[PDB]
From a paper:
Insulin binds with high affinity to the insulin receptor (IR), while IGF-1 binds with highest affinity to the IGF-1 receptor (IGF1R)2.
To explore the structural basis of the substrate preference and the role of the Leu to Phe change at the NPEY+1 position, we compared the previously reported structures of the Shc and IRS-1 phosphotyrosine-binding domains (PTB domains) bound to the phosphorylated NPEY motif peptides. The crystal structure of the IRS-1 PTB domain was determined in complex with a peptide representing the juxtamembrane region of the IR, which has a Leu in the Y+1 position. Both the Shc and IRS-1 PTB domains bind the receptor peptide in a generally similar manner. The four to five residues immediately N terminal to the NPEY motif form a β-strand that is sandwiched between the C-terminal α-helix and strand β5 of the PTB domain, while the NPEY motif forms a turn that positions the phosphorylated tyrosine in a positively charged pocket. However, unlike the IRS-1 PTB domain, the Shc-PTB domain contains a large insertion that creates a hydrophobic pocket that coordinates the phenylalanine residue in the Y+1 position. These observations provide a structural rationale for preferential binding of Shc to IGF1R. Thus, while the Tyr residue in NPEY motif is essential for substrate recruitment, it is the residues surrounding the NPEY motif that dictate the substrate preference, and a key residue in these interactions is the Leu versus Phe at Y+1 position after NPEY motif.
Residue numbers in the entry:
A (entry chain A): 161 to 265
B (entry chain B): 1001 to 1009
Amino acid sequence: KEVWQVILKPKGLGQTKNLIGIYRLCLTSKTISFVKLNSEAAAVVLQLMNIRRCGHSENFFFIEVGRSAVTGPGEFWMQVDDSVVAQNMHETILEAMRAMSDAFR
Amino acid sequence: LYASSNPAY
């Protein structure tokens, strides 16, 4: 359970699905939820198992999502305040993905 | 860009 405040950019699925602006991105051990600020409904709930890749570049964090995702395939790009926050998101989400694959063994 | 593949994909 981590929560980050992000700006979802037009780039990729943002434009396509009109998911643009300030969201809270909430992480459990299995899913990531995008909730628009002041909304009482999650706009989209993604399973970690349907994320192909994630990464960052300075103050930007991205998720690429595969063919079985609720959104269909594509990329989300989000802007945060700085590269310390973006690296944190990368490392924490990567950590949850590894915990998920190791739980089988 | 720094990217990681998801081991649980």
